[PDB]
Amino acid sequence: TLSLQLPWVEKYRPQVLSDIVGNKETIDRLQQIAKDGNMPHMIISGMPGIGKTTSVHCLAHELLGRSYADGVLELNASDDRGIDVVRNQIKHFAQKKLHLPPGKHKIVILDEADSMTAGAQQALRRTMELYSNSTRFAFACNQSNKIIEPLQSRCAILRYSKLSDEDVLKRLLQIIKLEDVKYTNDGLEAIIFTAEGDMRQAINNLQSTVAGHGLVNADNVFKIVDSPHPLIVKKMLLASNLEDSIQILRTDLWKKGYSSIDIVTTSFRVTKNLAQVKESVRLEMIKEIGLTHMRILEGVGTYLQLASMLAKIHKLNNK
Amino acid sequence: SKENLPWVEKYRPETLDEVYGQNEVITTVRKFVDEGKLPHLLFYGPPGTGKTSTIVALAREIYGKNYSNMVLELNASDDRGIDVVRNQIKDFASTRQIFSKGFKLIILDEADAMTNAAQNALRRVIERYTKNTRFCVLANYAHKLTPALLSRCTRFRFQPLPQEAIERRIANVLVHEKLKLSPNAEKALIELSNGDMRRVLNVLQSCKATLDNPDEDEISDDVIYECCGAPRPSDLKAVLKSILEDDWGTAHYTLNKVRSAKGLALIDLIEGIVKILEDYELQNEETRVHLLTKLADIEYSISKGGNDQIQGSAVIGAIKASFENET
Amino acid sequence: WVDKYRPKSLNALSHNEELTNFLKSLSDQPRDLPHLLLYGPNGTGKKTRCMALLESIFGPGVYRLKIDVRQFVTASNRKLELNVVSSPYHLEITPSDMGNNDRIVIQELLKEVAQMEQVDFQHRYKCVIINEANSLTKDAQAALRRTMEKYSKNIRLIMVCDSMSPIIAPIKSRCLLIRCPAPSDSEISTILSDVVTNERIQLETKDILKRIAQASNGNLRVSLLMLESMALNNELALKSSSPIIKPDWIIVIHKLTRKIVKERSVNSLIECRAVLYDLLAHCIPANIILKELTFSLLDVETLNTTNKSSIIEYSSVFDERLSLGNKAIFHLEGFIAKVMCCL
Amino acid sequence: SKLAAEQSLAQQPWVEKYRPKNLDEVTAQDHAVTVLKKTLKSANLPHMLFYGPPGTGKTSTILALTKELYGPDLMKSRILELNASDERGISIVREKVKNFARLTVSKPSKHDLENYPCPPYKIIILDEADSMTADAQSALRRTMETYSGVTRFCLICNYVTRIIDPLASRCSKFRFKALDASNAIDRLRFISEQENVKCDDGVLERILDISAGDLRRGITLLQSASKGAQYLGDGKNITSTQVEELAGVVPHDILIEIVEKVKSGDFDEIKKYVNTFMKSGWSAASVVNQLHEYYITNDNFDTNFKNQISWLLFTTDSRLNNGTNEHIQLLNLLVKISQL
Amino acid sequence: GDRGGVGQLAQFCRKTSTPLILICNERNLPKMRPFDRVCLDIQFRRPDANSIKSRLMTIAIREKFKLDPNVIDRLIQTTRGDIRQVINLLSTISTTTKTINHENINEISKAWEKNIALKPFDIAHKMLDGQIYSDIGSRNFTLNDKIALYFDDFDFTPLMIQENYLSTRPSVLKPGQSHLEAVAEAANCISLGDIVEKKIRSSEQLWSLLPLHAVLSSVYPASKVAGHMAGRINFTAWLGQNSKSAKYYRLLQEIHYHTRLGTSTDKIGLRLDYLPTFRKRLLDPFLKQGADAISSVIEVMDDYYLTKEDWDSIMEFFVGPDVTTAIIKKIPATVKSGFTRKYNSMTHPV
DNA sequence: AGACACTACGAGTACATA
DNA sequence: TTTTTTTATGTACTCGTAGTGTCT
Ligand SMILES: Nc1ncnc2c1ncn2[C@@H]1O[C@H](COP(=O)(O)OP(=O)(O)OP(O)(O)=S)[C@@H](O)[C@H]1O
Ligand SMILES: Nc1ncnc2c1ncn2[C@@H]1O[C@H](COP(=O)(O)OP(=O)(O)OP(O)(O)=S)[C@@H](O)[C@H]1O
Ligand SMILES: Nc1ncnc2c1ncn2[C@@H]1O[C@H](COP(=O)(O)OP(=O)(O)OP(O)(O)=S)[C@@H](O)[C@H]1O
Ligand SMILES: Nc1ncnc2c1ncn2[C@@H]1O[C@H](COP(=O)(O)OP(=O)(O)O)[C@@H](O)[C@H]1O
Ligand SMILES: [Mg+2]
Ligand SMILES: [Mg+2]
Ligand SMILES: [Mg+2]
């Protein structure tokens, strides 16, 4: 063991906008924008692992050509992005002179824009407004609500959605063809099922299964990757009998090493995002789940507390 | 010398072959490191399952005896903020190794106590520096980690140690130490562990110290139960039978004499009665609802103190009122 | 006045002779004395008995005390300034004058006085009187748990409280427990006779004094103050039918109870919330408000046993809620709404 | 030096005067001190977690163990006692505790190795670990897991649930049992004999009966009864009534009056008697305990009534354990148990 | 804050010889409070649809882009009065789709919806809206949206709910349940959310319970009493009452620390017991004995180390049938003048 | 030798927290 | 249609007395 290889998420990271299997509308929009030029300020939002950072990187690359190194200013959440940085470095880059083609502009990529402080976000307003003819801003975040409305008013809003099973399946088939990996339909279906619209997680699980077992089969996938956590919790809460929910909680969750805090948090989230039952029933279930969580946080987290929570939920469902 | 360390620390695995229980994870990790394709790891599991030992033995297999120098190991004991990330982790990832050639390893042990800003700053460090360094995040609760950081690592769930693995480790210890163990005593030891090797090792050391002999005798179930102060199944079932069948005064006297002759705790008796009544096939689930609710309430009240006699009488009355509906 | 006539020694007490003899027993050997916790009804005379016991443990100079100012710094730039009542033989601390920052004051001041040795030119230890130990949060009590045992040769605690419910079990175990039962109406009337004989009050009938006792519920602090108050309305000459002067908050609570029992609606609930706000804004605790409102609602003869049982049940429930909460009005309005729904 | 300490002990309260100095003075907690004595000859002391009711002797046990291990000389240099009267946030745990654990063990003198085992590790005890925040507790994990070669951790608490699961897994759990009459009558009789406490036959066993598994409270009550008997100077023996009158126990006749008021009577007279009873200061916890004992031990009530009385007493005790008003809770309990 | 350029500009707005124009997006802010009465305030409101429609037609015919006037109204109402966002939307969508009349406007509006946080008063209106909790409205404004509503401002939403939850007309009353029962259940859930909030903002920093406090304090009491707004949405008065009670507690603490030398009682034990007699000792001799009862009051206040400010603060604690705000005005001004004159003349031992 | 630009460690002030 | 709330560690900004290398 002297050197390692690049992971398939980084090795097969798309370098052109055509290789992105995400939202076709926004991808074609960015393709036409990069082909014609005049890229405006944009804010790309969505969920992790759907192709937001790669999208803006490919856009900037194909738009700037060889001038990417001197025309693109990349700032992540790992670097200081306070009011002082926006005042000095971002302003110096926006005021910096650079002879570009008559259809391009300097791009300022700000990854994880939902983490910038309010002062920096406020100072960026006039910084992006006074130099909007030679400097363009592209924000990439997960929550558009964390960015102030004045900043959102000066840019386009691109909301990336979850990747359907078709797109992730197509990308996985392309990766398999480029890697020559023996697979099976049930294995790919299990990978898509455990990915939950997360392309990066899907590729990571695929690489793990390949390097751990060689053959991509549903058996090996379920052996190396457990079933999704929220779905088992939903099946436990939606049980019709108390015995079935108790058996599910015992075998699937408690006997597999899931902590009580994770169980109660997943139960709260599932009941909040549930739609099968009425609003009042969901409110009573959330009330009971919170009453249980208040005991779980105090160090009384055991199997008896979760059993009592399930019993109270079933008593509520017992009309 | 190692002969002064406690049994939990003395018997810490130094190679990947001494980590029992996890076979699907250990084999896949060995294949990862053999073929070279080692992704970012996320070891999620309960305490005492062998995550820290696994990653330490892995770093030892990767770098040799030079593990303590070619690996950046951060934990909750060390200050882990956003500035700590920005300086230490980025400077460790960006530069090269001082002693040999190869990728670097950042072991963020117990990273479930990190700040949200620290994880938001680290999620782009993991994605930017990924050709010369690696990240291994150890966690007991997967809810304290942001989904962005949670999606960048390959998740390995450390299941609780099964019967065979704990029995194998117990046999290894009984070979390493001049100690003998009874079969039923071994089964009772497996029962009070819940897949925790730390508890098994600690109580094994305690029962070896309890023997009071030059270790020419065997460790029976009585020694174990008197060491961990846990109630015996015999007294457990006797108390349950006296509660279910005998009168109120008789059940009260039985519970009092059982909990005062051996010095047992009410919480242990409650847990044992809950475990026993789980196999009881009963009528309409209303009795189970009442039993679970009242027992959990009594447990939560015990977790804050109070009158032990009042709580014992409450347990008796709750069990009786719950089984009064199963008729 | 209640201050002009107050006992200064153990031989000057006029009620609970058994408690006086027990205090003499406990003060016979003063150096072999453990920590003490005086508990009982509010206004029995435990704060006077503690000072009388200190007057037997030390010289008469225990009452010549002075108020000094001490400052503390929290984890931030915030500063706390509190007044300590100190004496050449003891000191008095009342952590009920601040919020959750009582633990810092407790630990720092107690460690300071423990490491500090007494001075001369006036026995061996310096007593600390913790007034109203019920306001001490669980953190400060836990901090004092080990301070009580680590320094037992220089610091002896005499904690005065009204109910051992909020006191943790370790602190209860770490000190003797002394109960101070409220004096009977006979002893209260006897003290009232003496104080009106000294203050030159004109009484046509003596039984009125007994009525004052029956209006104080064993409280001497309320009894004497009410006697002096009704002596000012009757111009130093109490009549045979002199009215009983009740505090303003008691009359407000009675009017609130009347409004509850007469009308039960949301429009009345708004007025109830307004009255509760006016009561809370004028330095009246919410636990006392709830207790008095419940006791006044139970006295209403228009209700039956079924109503009173539910009333006291909701009262206990919301008392637990208020003891677990901080926004007192959020629980008081809920209790009032539940009572309205019950009736 | 030594004589000054002897005189100071002789002029201290009986709780601190008779504090166990060796691992032999502890009477009832034998299972833990047996392991503590057997590990004294060896050198593999593990991380320990003492938990149990208050007044069972956890702090005394760890102090006696540290003494028997290190001697009165190394006792002040190889120990780190952190109580609840100090700051124990994340900052303290990260700086001070970790710096002390990373320190090397102090070199023993020539006189130390001759009489004491002098193990190659030091002990960092944390008394009253219930007040430690969960983050400061999780910070101790690797601190105690990596520096185990040079330091040993001893957590002490009353509620084991207040400590996080990883810390409870890293430390070996020692549960201290309640000190009832059977396992503490020897210690109580020894304390009474050493102080010439002239008592009757069934006094000491009664004292611990009021203690409910608490030897500190029993010793304090014994000292109070001894002071009350020496002040009188009558030369007689202390009786169970003289002990129960100062222990906060309600007399039997007052309890029979309460039972008669609950059995026969409506809301009004019950409320009036409760208001009169609250004038005489009694702790509602003791009243609830005595009512529970009377109702459960009496062979005159139905099982259906006994289940309900047990649940009601449990609810009342749980509500009283939060600092509620004693009068309201007692009245509610008596009214609820009056309605069948 | 106290230090910053905001106050400097506020003071500059008072002394200047050159016009000073100020532009801001949020006016009703605490930091913007010094600008309340110093500069002429002008409010730019939601623009009309006609001018924006004409401008859009112009920039559309100029940019070779097809657009009907029937879509501009929807574009504006989804944009919520921002011509800049409308222009950016047109420039962004025109590059691929050159015509948007009635077909692709649904996805355009669903993708460009303005996710703006509501003011602490609009959250009270939306929370107490009975249509949202109906069977049809529940599957449109889901529970996740209701919790995000609270999370928009989690410092005022529970207080705003508790303030005006009993001032509405409920339309979700279950068959057999009156308004009082729903109000009592809402108040019980308010108390439970109070306990949860106390557990959150206390030691151990249990902030992970914030979503639960969302339901118990805001969502459930609103759902129990959702309906029409009877009157107006009243601002939470708990803050002012808390400030007043804190000030009164400070004053009572000063009074107790002044008279501790004589009372030897607690703060509450003095407020409940001593003040009903201190009032009749100090103030009552003024109503019956004219101006010759001054020496008695001075001696009484000296015997417990009272002050003039303490005397004025004592008379403010009494409520109900005993209010001195008119009794002090009934006192002849000569008596008060003589009292305050004798106060600054005789020496007082602290 | 000394004055004063450059500077980096420290006390104070707020601001969030799913 | 509008004002406030105890505390606990992490984060960011600011002034700022201070310690030392340098130039008129
Ligand atoms: N549409 C896609 N087509 C192909 N690969 C993709 C796609 N989306 C994601 N990936 C893979 O996922 C990796 C990481 O994607 P990212 O763009 O970083 O995720 P993200 O959408 O930016 O969400 P974040 O960064 O967690 S907020 C890429 O390097 C690709 O390997
Ligand atoms: N699979 C295992 N095989 C052998 N010994 C084990 C195993 N798991 C745990 N142990 C023992 O338990 C000790 C502690 O293991 P750790 O890996 O530190 O526990 P953990 O999985 O990291 O859980 P934490 O540290 O509480 S989050 C080791 O030193 C071993 O002695
Ligand atoms: N087992 C015991 N044997 C003899 N005396 C004991 C025993 N347990 C307690 N005591 C007495 O009680 C006193 C208090 O002992 P501690 O060890 O402080 O009690 P504790 O277990 O620490 O209770 P806490 O501190 O409230 S958790 C000792 O000084 C002894 O006098
Ligand atoms: N034995 C007694 N004889 C006469 N008056 C007493 C006696 N005990 C207490 N008092 C009166 O009680 C008043 C003080 O009450 P206090 O002790 O503050 O109430 P609490 O017991 O709530 O602390 C004094 O003014 C004093 O006159
Ligand atoms: Mg991204
Ligand atoms: Mg670990
Ligand atoms: Mg202790």
Can you tell me which residue has the tokens 């259906």? D304
Distance CA C125, CA C148 (A): 13
H helix intervals, E94-156? 105-111, 122-127, 135-138, 143-152
The torsion defined by the Cα of E343, E344, E349 and E350, in degrees rounded to 10, comes to 100
**Cβ neighbour number for residue E209 with a 10 Å cutoff:** 18
Smallest CA–C1' separation from E210, nucleotide: F18
Using an 8 Å Cβ cutoff, are A152 and A43 in contact? yes
Distance CA B71, CA B212 (A): 44
Nearest to C20 by CA among C53, C42, C59: C53
Max CA separation in chain E (angstroms)? 96
Q: What is the 8-class DSSP label of residue C173?
A: H
Q: Which residue is nearest to nucleotide G15 (CA to C1')?
A: E3
D130 alpha carbon, closest ligand: 3
Phi, psi of D319 (to 5 degrees): -75, -35
Give how far the C-alpha of residue D5 lies from the chain's centroid of Cα atoms, to the nearest Å.
Answer: 25
Shortest CA distance from B29: residue in chain A: A212
Nearest to D319 by CA among D306, D309, D328, D308: D328
Does residue A158 share a domain with residue A23? yes
Distance CA E187, CA C266 (A): 12
Question: Is any ligand 3 atom within 6 A of the Cβ of residue D188?
Answer: no
* Strands D79-82 vs D48-51: parallel, antiparallel or unpaired: unpaired
Annotated binding site of A for ATP: 9, 21, 46-54, 142, 200
Chain E residues in contact with C265 (beta carbon < 8 A) = 180
Distance CA D129, CA D133 (A): 9
Give how far the C-alpha of residue C303 lies from the chain's centroid of Cα atoms, to the nearest Å.
Answer: 32
Phi, psi of C62 (to 5 degrees): -65, -30
Q: Of D134, D156, D179, which one is at a domain's C-terminal end?
A: D179
* Strand arrangement of the beta sheet that strand C79-86 belongs to: C66-73, C79-86, C90-93, C126-131, C155-160, C36-39, C176-179
Can you tell me which residue has the tokens 């950072």? A53
Quote the tokens at residue C103. Answer: 């633990």
Using an 8 Å Cβ cutoff, are C315 and D319 in contact? no
E205 touches strand G (CB under 7 A): yes
Chains contacting chain B through 3 or more C-beta pairs under 8 A: A, D
E28 touches strand G (CB under 7 A): yes
Can you tell me which residue has the tokens 């990271």? A13
Chain F footprint positions (protein CB, under 7 Å): 11-18
**Alpha carbon distances (Å) from A318 to A313, B12, B284, E276:** 9, 51, 12, 56
Number of alpha carbons in the 13 Å side-chain half-sphere of residue E51: 6
Q: Whose CA is nearest to atom 15 of ligand 3?
A: D57
Does residue D173 share a domain with residue D214? no
Q: Of D249, D275, D309, which one is at a domain's C-terminal end?
A: D249
Q: What is the SS3 assignment for E57?
A: helix
Chain A residues 88 to 147 with C-beta below 7 Å from nucleic strand G: 117, 119-120
Using an 8 Å Cβ cutoff, are C208 and C245 in contact? no
Using an 8 Å Cβ cutoff, are D159 and D130 in contact? yes
Phi, psi of C179 (to 5 degrees): -90, 135
Interface touch A305/B300, C-beta < 8 Å: yes
Using an 8 Å Cβ cutoff, are C203 and C26 in contact? no
Does residue A6 share a domain with residue A148? yes
Residue type, D62: I
Distance CA A55, CA A41 (A): 14
Using an 8 Å Cβ cutoff, are D151 and D121 in contact? yes
Quote the tokens at residue E52. Answer: 């924006």
**Cβ neighbour number for residue C104 with a 10 Å cutoff:** 20
Interface touch A300/D161, C-beta < 8 Å: yes
Quote the tokens at residue D85. Answer: 């009267």
Distance CA A233, CA D141 (A): 30
Distance CA D52, CA D65 (A): 18
**Among E76, E85, E149, which would you mutate to test the A interface (most chain A Cβ atoms within 10 Å of its Cβ)?**
E85
Nearest to D88 by CA among D46, D140, D151, D157: D140
Ligand 3 site-directed mutation target among C149, C173, C174, most atoms within 8 Å of CB: C149
Q: What is the 8-class DSSP label of residue C135?
A: G
Distance CA D125, CA D65 (A): 12
Instruction: Tell me the CA–C1' distance in angstroms for C225 and F15.
Output: 50
Residue type, E5: G
Quote the tokens at residue C140. Answer: 């400060």
B12 alpha carbon, closest ligand: 2
E262 touches chain C (CB under 8 A): yes
Instruction: Tell me the CA–C1' distance in angstroms for C77 and G18.
Output: 21
Using an 8 Å Cβ cutoff, are D150 and D103 in contact? yes
E227 forms beta bridges with E129, E170
Does residue A80 share a domain with residue A19? yes
Does residue D23 share a domain with residue D151? yes
Distance CA C163, CA C160 (A): 9
Angle A109-A112-A113 from CA coordinates, rounded to 5°: 75
Using an 8 Å Cβ cutoff, are B302 and B263 in contact? no
Q: Which residue is nearest to nucleotide F17 (CA to C1')?
A: E207
Distance CA D247, CA E328 (A): 53
Distance CA C222, CA C185 (A): 13
> Domain tally for chain D?
3
Beta strands (DSSP E) in chain D are 48-51, 79-82, 122-126, 151-157, 172-175
B49 labelled binding-site residue: yes
Quote the tokens at residue B147. Answer: 């989904």
Using an 8 Å Cβ cutoff, are D152 and D46 in contact? yes
The kind and range of the H/E element at E315 are: none
Q: What is the SS3 assignment for D166?
A: helix
Quote the tokens at residue B131. Answer: 């050709």
Number of alpha carbons in the 13 Å side-chain half-sphere of residue C170: 27
C176 forms beta bridges with C36
H helix intervals, chain C? 17-28, 46-57, 102-115, 138-150, 169-173, 185-198, 207-216, 220-233, 248-262, 266-280, 286-298, 305-324, 328-342
Smallest CA–C1' separation from A143, nucleotide: F18
Q: Of D249, D274, D306, which one is at a domain's C-terminal end?
A: D249
Give how far the C-alpha of residue A230 lies from the chain's centroid of Cα atoms, to the nearest Å.
Answer: 16
Cβ-proximal residues to E216 (8 Å cutoff; 6+ apart), any chain: A287, A290, E189, E190, E192, E193, E196
Smallest CA–C1' separation from C76, nucleotide: F12
Q: Which domain holds residue D198?
A: 180-249
Using an 8 Å Cβ cutoff, are E302 and E348 in contact? yes
Nearest to B317 by CA among B289, B290, B279: B290
Size of interface A-B (CB pairs under 8 A): 153
Does residue A239 share a domain with residue A216? no
Q: What is the 8-class DSSP label of residue B87?
A: I
Using an 8 Å Cβ cutoff, are B284 and A242 in contact? no
Q: Which residue is nearest to nucleotide F13 (CA to C1')?
A: E1
Using an 8 Å Cβ cutoff, are C52 and C10 in contact? yes
Residue count (chain E) = 350
Nearest to C238 by CA among C247, C228, C246: C228
Q: Which domain holds residue A284?
A: 228-319
**Cβ neighbour number for residue A306 with a 10 Å cutoff:** 25
**Cβ neighbour number for residue C332 with a 10 Å cutoff:** 26
Q: Which residues 213-252 on chain A approach chain D with CB closer than 8 angstroms?
A: none
Using an 8 Å Cβ cutoff, are C313 and D332 in contact? yes
Q: Is the dihedral of CA B59, B62, B64, B66 positive or negative?
A: negative
Q: Which residues 191-220 on chain B approach chain A with CB closer than 8 angstroms?
A: 195
C37 forms beta bridges with C159, C177
Chain A residues in contact with D165 (beta carbon < 8 A) = 301
Does residue A17 share a domain with residue A92? yes
Q: Of A180, A196, A227, which one is at a domain's C-terminal end?
A: A227
Rounded to a whole number of angstroms, the distance from the CA of C44 to the nearest CA of chain E is 12
Q: What is the SS3 assignment for A159?
A: strand
Quote the tokens at residue A50. Answer: 């759907």
Does residue D29 share a domain with residue D175? yes
Q: Residue E87: exposed, middle, or buried by beta-carbon count in 10 A (0-12, 13-18, 19+)?
A: middle
Does residue A214 share a domain with residue A123? no
Smallest CA–C1' separation from D92, nucleotide: G9
C157 forms beta bridges with C128
> Domain tally for chain A?
3
Q: Residue D245: exposed, middle, or buried by beta-carbon count in 10 A (0-12, 13-18, 19+)?
A: middle
Question: Between D28, D34, D159, which is nearest B303 by CB?
Answer: D159
Q: What is the SS3 assignment for B219?
A: strand
Using an 8 Å Cβ cutoff, are B264 and B231 in contact? yes
Chains contacting chain D through 3 or more C-beta pairs under 8 A: A, B, C, E
Shortest CA distance from B325: residue in chain D: D304
Interface touch C25/D282, C-beta < 8 Å: no
B198 alpha carbon, closest ligand: 2
Distance CA A111, CA A19 (A): 21
* Strands C36-39 vs B104-108: parallel, antiparallel or unpaired: unpaired
**Alpha carbon distances (Å) from E251 to C44, C280, C284, E77:** 27, 15, 13, 53
Q: Whose CA is nearest to atom 22 of ligand 4?
A: C43
Q: What is the SS3 assignment for E293?
A: coil
* Strands C90-93 vs C79-86: parallel, antiparallel or unpaired: antiparallel
Q: What is the SS3 assignment for D145?
A: helix
Distance CA E182, CA E250 (A): 38
**Cβ neighbour number for residue E236 with a 10 Å cutoff:** 18
Chain D residues in contact with E203 (beta carbon < 8 A) = 133
Chain G footprint positions (protein CB, under 7 Å): 1-15
E120 touches strand G (CB under 7 A): yes
Residue type, C343: L
Question: Is any ligand 3 atom within 6 A of the Cβ of residue D218?
Answer: no
Shortest CA distance from B109: residue in chain D: D142
Distance CA D126, CA A90 (A): 51
Question: Is any ligand 3 atom within 6 A of the Cβ of residue D27?
Answer: yes
Question: Is any ligand 3 atom within 6 A of the Cβ of residue D183?
Answer: no
A216 forms beta bridges with A183
Domain ranges in chain B are 1-161, 162-230, 231-327
Distance CA D56, CA B32 (A): 53
Question: Is any ligand 2 atom within 6 A of the Cβ of residue B81?
Answer: no
Does residue D37 share a domain with residue D8? yes
D168 touches chain A (CB under 8 A): no
Does residue D74 share a domain with residue D4? yes
Distance CA E173, CA D43 (A): 72
Using an 8 Å Cβ cutoff, are A86 and A124 in contact? yes
Residue-range domains of chain C with CATH = 17-179 (3.40.50.300), 185-238 (1.10.8.60), 248-342 (1.20.272.10)
Distance CA C147, CA E335 (A): 55
B113 forms beta bridges with none
Chain E residues in contact with C270 (beta carbon < 8 A) = 166-167
The CA B59 to ligand 2 mean position distance, Å, reads 16
B101 labelled binding-site residue: no
Which approach determined this entry? cryo-EM
D162 touches chain A (CB under 8 A): yes
Does residue D320 share a domain with residue D191? no
Does residue A105 share a domain with residue A29? yes
Core vs surface per residue D80-95: b (16+ CB within 10 A) or e? bbbbbbeebebebbbe
A294 touches chain E (CB under 8 A): yes
Does residue D66 share a domain with residue D144? yes
Question: Is any ligand 2 atom within 6 A of the Cβ of residue B156?
Answer: no
B278 labelled binding-site residue: no
The kind and range of the H/E element at E236 are: none
Using an 8 Å Cβ cutoff, are E162 and E133 in contact? no
